[PDB]
Design a protein around this ligand. Structure first.
Ligand SMILES: [Zn+2]
Ligand SMILES: [Zn+2]
Lengths: 49, 250, 64, 49, 48, 49
């Protein structure tokens, strides 16, 4: 059955239990941004450090 | 500290852009000025360079930690720099630096031990030692028996209780000065002997003498000096394997 | 490591059925009958007990 | 005396050779750990054939 | 709330911009610098 | 296919199953610091600055 309107779904859905795993790559670790940050000293190019 | 409107009173720096900000105004006086991280050729010390390899060979032959060695390296460097004692054998100075560092770490090793790892006579090491004390103008510390209770008893694989009993026996003996004029080790070994003789882990004086390096008669003499108080010198927390009355005489 | 207190899908309380489950398998019951004697009739609530590995009993072997 | 050789864990020359699970847990070791690696400066190194 | 865009002040957007500069680095739709004509770059995080 | 948010290798997942412990985990991390005497005067020490 549809969850928003309670109507039946014309097709029949294939459902069953399976075994999933959670990989190591999470999103809290891959987001980063720079906007006028620290720069180097000799060549004055943007630096992270 | 400065600003065009006022002489600055305080200039904080920021982890963000990396710059110097001035809170009485917010003005970024500095602008990303701060960095946010806040052989054959050798002639000099060809012999000094080799001496520290030889320090590293000799110092850790007994497996002394690197922190001790690093100051030994720093000590020599200092002794080298003054060069007042420059006209002397390097290996003696290295060995003397080594004796000092152990004392500086509060864990001296006997010259006898230091001799084991070097060719230098105890006399020349002592001589050089004095010169370094005078050279570097620094004081030293007196020896304690307990500092050698650990490894010797270890070398005999004696249990801590015997080891600790010996230490008290030694400690009580020195507080009472039962053995005036004597080196700490000879007195300690006899205490260890007495202790070992107060446990099942008895050993012959010659074996102990062999481990400490002292003469078997010197222990025998030192024993004669501590024997009058053998019973009372023991710690209150002890379990005899042999009555003090049954303690042997020599 | 320890039995969850609620089935992830229904929400039915499971965390109080682990000792009774071991007690029924203790005597002679098959896993199919022990799960019926407890009242677990949806196959989402039977997966909870049927596929649980109890690691807490092996971390109690290390002295505190 | 000559020198010191590293020791592969769970060998015949390790301190864990032939122990029972009641003693492996008493030294804070895992009875399921396979062994076969060296401990060199804290790290755990493994040799590739 | 980290990347910025420098917006010149004109009598068409003076009120909106001073409203934005009232709230700085704490509310999200804010601002974090003022660059006056002299080149003076003041920081809103430290201004009392 | 439910609402288009699982197209091209994605998954829709139940929010009120995540609230009952589904695929929850923890994350540890260690840091080292070592006090050192690099020189005869330059010396480090742990203290409250
Ligand atoms: Zn200012
Ligand atoms: Zn359920």
């Amino acid at each position: 059955y549809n969850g928003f309107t309670g109507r039946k779904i014309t097709s029949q859905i294939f459902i069953g239990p399976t075994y999933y795993q959670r990989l190591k790559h999470m999103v809290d670790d891959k987001i980063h941004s720079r906007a006028r940050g620290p720069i180097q000293i000799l060549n004055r190019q943007p630096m992270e450090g | 500290v400065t600003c065009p409107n006022h002489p600055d009173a305080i200039l904080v720096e920021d982890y963000r852009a990396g710059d110097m900000i001035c809170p009485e105004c917010g003005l970024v006086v500095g602008d990303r000025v701060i960095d946010v991280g806040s052989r054959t050729m050798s002639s000099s010390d060809r012999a000094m360079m080799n001496a520290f390899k030889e320090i590293t060979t000799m110092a850790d032959r007994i497996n002394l930690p690197r922190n001790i060695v690093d100051r030994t390296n720093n000590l020599f460097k200092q002794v080298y720099e003054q060069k007042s004692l420059k006209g002397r054998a390097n290996d003696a100075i290295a060995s003397a630096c080594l004796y000092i560092a152990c004392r500086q770490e509060g864990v001296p090793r006997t010259f006898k031990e230091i001799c084991a790892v070097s060719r230098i006579s105890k006399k020349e090491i002592g001589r050089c030692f004095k010169l370094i004390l005078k050279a570097l103008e620094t004081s030293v510390d007196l020896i304690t028996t307990g500092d050698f209770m650990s490894r010797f008893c270890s070398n005999l694989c004696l249990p801590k209780q015997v080891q600790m009993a010996a230490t008290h026996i030694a400690r009580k003996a020195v507080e009472l000065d039962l053995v005036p004029g004597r080196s700490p080790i000879s007195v300690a070994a006899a205490a260890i002997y007495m202790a070992s003789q107060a446990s099942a882990e008895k050993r012959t004086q010659k074996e102990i003498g062999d481990i400490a390096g002292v003469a078997d008669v010197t222990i025998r003499q030192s024993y004669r000096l501590i024997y009058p108080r053998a019973p009372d010198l023991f710690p209150t927390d002890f379990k005899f394997d042999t009555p003090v009355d049954k303690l042997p005489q020599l | 490591m320890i039995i969850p207190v609620r089935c992830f899908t229904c929400g039915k309380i499971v965390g109080n059925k682990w000792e009774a489950y071991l007690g029924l398998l203790q005597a002679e019951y098959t896993e199919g009958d022990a799960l019926d004697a407890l009242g677990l009739k949806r196959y989402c609530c039977r997966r909870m007990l049927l596929a649980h590995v109890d690691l807490i009993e092996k971390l109690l072997n290390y002295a505190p | 005396f000559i020198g010191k050789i590293p020791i592969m864990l769970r060998s015949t020359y390790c301190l864990l050779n032939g122990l029972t699970d009641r003693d492996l847990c008493e030294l804070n070791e895992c009875p399921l750990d396979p062994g076969g690696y060296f401990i060199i400066n804290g790290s755990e190194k493994v040799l590739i054939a | 709330a980290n990347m910025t865009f420098a917006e010149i002040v004109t009598p068409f957007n003076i009120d909106r911009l001073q409203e934005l500069v009232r709230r700085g680095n704490s509310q999200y739709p804010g601002a974090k610098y003022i660059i006056r004509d002299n080149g003076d770059r003041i920081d809103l995080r430290f201004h009392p | 296919s439910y609402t288009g948010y699982n197209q091209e290798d994605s998954v829709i997942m139940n929010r009120s199953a995540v609230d009952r412990g589904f695929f929850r985990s923890v994350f540890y991390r260690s840091y080292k610091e070592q006090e050192s005497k690099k020189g005869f005067d330059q010396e480090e020490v742990f203290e409250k600055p």
